[PDB]
Amino acid sequence: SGFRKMAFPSGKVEGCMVQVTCGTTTLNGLWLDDVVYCPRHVICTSEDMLNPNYEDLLIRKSNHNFLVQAGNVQLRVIGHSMQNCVLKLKVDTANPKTPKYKFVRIQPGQTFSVLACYNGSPSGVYQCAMRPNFTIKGSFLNGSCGSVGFNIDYDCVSFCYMHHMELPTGVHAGTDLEGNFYGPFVDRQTAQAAGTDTTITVNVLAWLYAAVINGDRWFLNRFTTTLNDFNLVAMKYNYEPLTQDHVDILGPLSAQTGIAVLDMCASLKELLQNGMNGRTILGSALLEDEFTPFDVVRQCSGVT
Amino acid sequence: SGFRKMAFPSGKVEGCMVQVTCGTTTLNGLWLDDVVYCPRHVICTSEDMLNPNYEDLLIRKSNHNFLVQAGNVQLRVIGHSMQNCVLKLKVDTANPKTPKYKFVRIQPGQTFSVLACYNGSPSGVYQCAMRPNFTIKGSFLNGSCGSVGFNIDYDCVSFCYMHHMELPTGVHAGTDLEGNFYGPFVDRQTAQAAGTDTTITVNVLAWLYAAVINGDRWFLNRFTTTLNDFNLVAMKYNYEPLTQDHVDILGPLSAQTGIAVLDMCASLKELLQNGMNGRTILGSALLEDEFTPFDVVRQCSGVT
Ligand SMILES: *[C@](O)(C(=O)NC)[C@H](C[C@@H]1CCNC1=O)NC(=O)[C@H](CC1CC1)n1cccc(NC(=O)Nc2ccccc2)c1=O
Ligand SMILES: *[C@](O)(C(=O)NC)[C@H](C[C@@H]1CCNC1=O)NC(=O)[C@H](CC1CC1)n1cccc(NC(=O)Nc2ccccc2)c1=O
């Protein structure tokens, strides 16, 4: 049994990761078929970062300015296109190991695997969630940019994130693979703080269900509640408003544990109102909100 | 910046994972060159599990009893050998994608990546530590057995663990790739509980150093201490005795933060004696002991 923060295998993505060099700047690229994707700020100097005009910066740039390196192989750029905040570089080769793939923009609450890369080479993989504020709590050093976040349907890799910037609080922002930022952020060295970081209620309820499954159950109260009731408690503790689909979604888990959603909503309610009082649910001494109902099911089923 | 529990890329290991079927039982195998490694309890029936005599069970078994499946390919077994609690199956093919590899037995405190597998296909990867008791806190369902834990030196994969059983408390035990159990455990369905789970002191000190680096510093006290002093506090809170090498090892971190080891030993000392009082160091409301000094450095350097 047992339960951990666990990421999708990285093998399929690994072999799509290449180094991109334009001038001084060097960051990571995603190579699918004969296109290579990268953050457009690869063309920016440090003096530009303050206030860049990417179109204008693009004038002076040509195919030959972009050094794309796949291990020890210098892919020939033969065409370059900007899309929102991504650069796409047409190359003369197709990636032999392009998998079945897709670009998806995820909703806030949804989780993905992040393969961290420095110089086209992967350092590590870790799982995180798209937070309500639209930020992520990543692990990212200078060089990391152009790393991507993904899910797999054991066949088709789904690309949701590409990393661009770090923010106050030491959190992160980035783009879908069409280069639109999650959240009202821009690629610019300017003051742009995050909003209020709210907790993903449904995700916690899943974590609590995962505890029951596993055996931790001390938090299980004898009371029930209402949706309206609980949502009136939730806003006080900056949790996200729990809806009916959210209820629907927790059904299978409810099914498996024989604990109605709304009873679990009341177990949580007291934990908000009374804290864990220095006990540990599933190892954590905090309420974990970075597991989707699906993420739990994956792990309490053995899906591959 | 930011800091996460992060696992080595799984790509190289992924392509060494195969399904092994002997009778009803079906578990995972590691295929390197022309040998396939699996837990020997693949030859056990449920009636055997109670008390198995593997030698005796082996008599009735032949090369043709072991179905090794690499995706949709039925590797020909041509020789079978038992080593402690592992089965090695000689096959007529070499694994095309065998990486530079090694078998290492790790010490308690050392961490590795676990690639969880069901039916030769990987479900997920996650990082955990070999605990002082010699157990691991894994995520493992029936089917998981024969999954392996590894580190990579970005070249050479080092194999340290292969998963066999789950224990009371919902923790796990297993073997090096030579099939010797970590800890005084046997492959048998019998009563065999773990010992006292102690905390890996040095690992926590690293986590604390990772906080300072990142920016969390509220726990930094104005006091210092002694090794003997702190170790007298540690035993009370079931932490591992901190030694001089452990001090030596924390040097680079000390170097980077300009905080002597022994000052950090005093910051910890109060946290033991006073608890976090419902604050969060690096997201966790608990003292995290599953990061090696090296693990921190990797992540606060960008090693690949
Ligand atoms: C990325 O460009 C890269 O890897 N390039 C090789 C880089 C990655 C980040 C740096 C360290 N960790 C990271 O995730 N990101 C940037 O340098 C980024 C460039 C974007 C396009 C404009 N960037 C530039 C300038 C400033 C910041 N962030 C801050 O300094 N913000 C901040 C202000 C106050 C307090 C805390 C943070 C930035 O991310
Ligand atoms: C493994 O054999 C497998 O995957 N086979 C296909 C399997 C994996 C575990 C089952 C669920 N999670 C796991 O990690 N392990 C076993 O079945 C294992 C076999 C070993 C060789 C003897 N095994 C058999 C019998 C009993 C246990 N453990 C317990 O039931 N122990 C226990 C007692 C009391 C309280 C809690 C646990 C066992 O692991």
Author numbering:
A (entry chain A), B (entry chain A): 1 to 304
Manuscript text:
The main protease Mpro is a clinically validated target to treat infections by the coronavirus SARS-CoV-2. Mpro cleaves the two polyproteins pp1a and pp1ab, which are translated from viral RNA, at 11 conserved sites and is essential for viral replication and multiplication. The active site of SARS-CoV-2 Mpro features a catalytic dyad comprising Cys145 and His41, with Cys145 being covalently bound to the N-benzyl-α-ketoamide in 13b. We established structure–activity relationships for the 13b series by modifying residues at the P1′, P3, and P4 sites.
Because the urea group is a bioisostere for a carbamate with enhanced stability, we prepared a series of ureas comprising 16a–e and 17. Analogues with substituted urea capping groups showed similar trends: The introduction of phenyl or benzyl groups attached to the urea as in 16e and 16d, respectively, led to an increase of potency with IC50s of 43 and 49 nM. This was rather due to the phenyl group and not due to the O → NH replacement because the latter alone had little impact on activity, as shown by the comparison of 6a and 16b. We therefore expected that this part of the molecule was amenable to larger structural variations and prepared the two subseries 12a–12h and 16a–16e. This yielded the most potent Mpro inhibitors 12d, 16d, or 16e in the 13b series of α-ketoamides that all exhibited IC50 values < 50 nM. Compound 16e also has a superior Tm value (73 °C) among all the analogs. Among the tested compounds, only the ureas 16c and 16e had half-lives > 0.5 h, whereas all other compounds, irrespective of high or medium plasma-protein binding, had half-lives < 0.4 h. Plasma clearance was high, except for 16e, for which a moderate plasma clearance was observed. For example, compound 16e was stable in in vitro assays and exhibited a clearance in vivo that was lower than that of 13b(6) or of other analogues synthesized here. Although the in vitro ADME properties of the α-ketoamides were promising, our in vivo PK data revealed a high clearance, which was only improved for the urea derivative 16e. The urea derivative 16e also exhibited the highest plasma protein binding, and it is conceivable that this property is important for protecting against clearance.
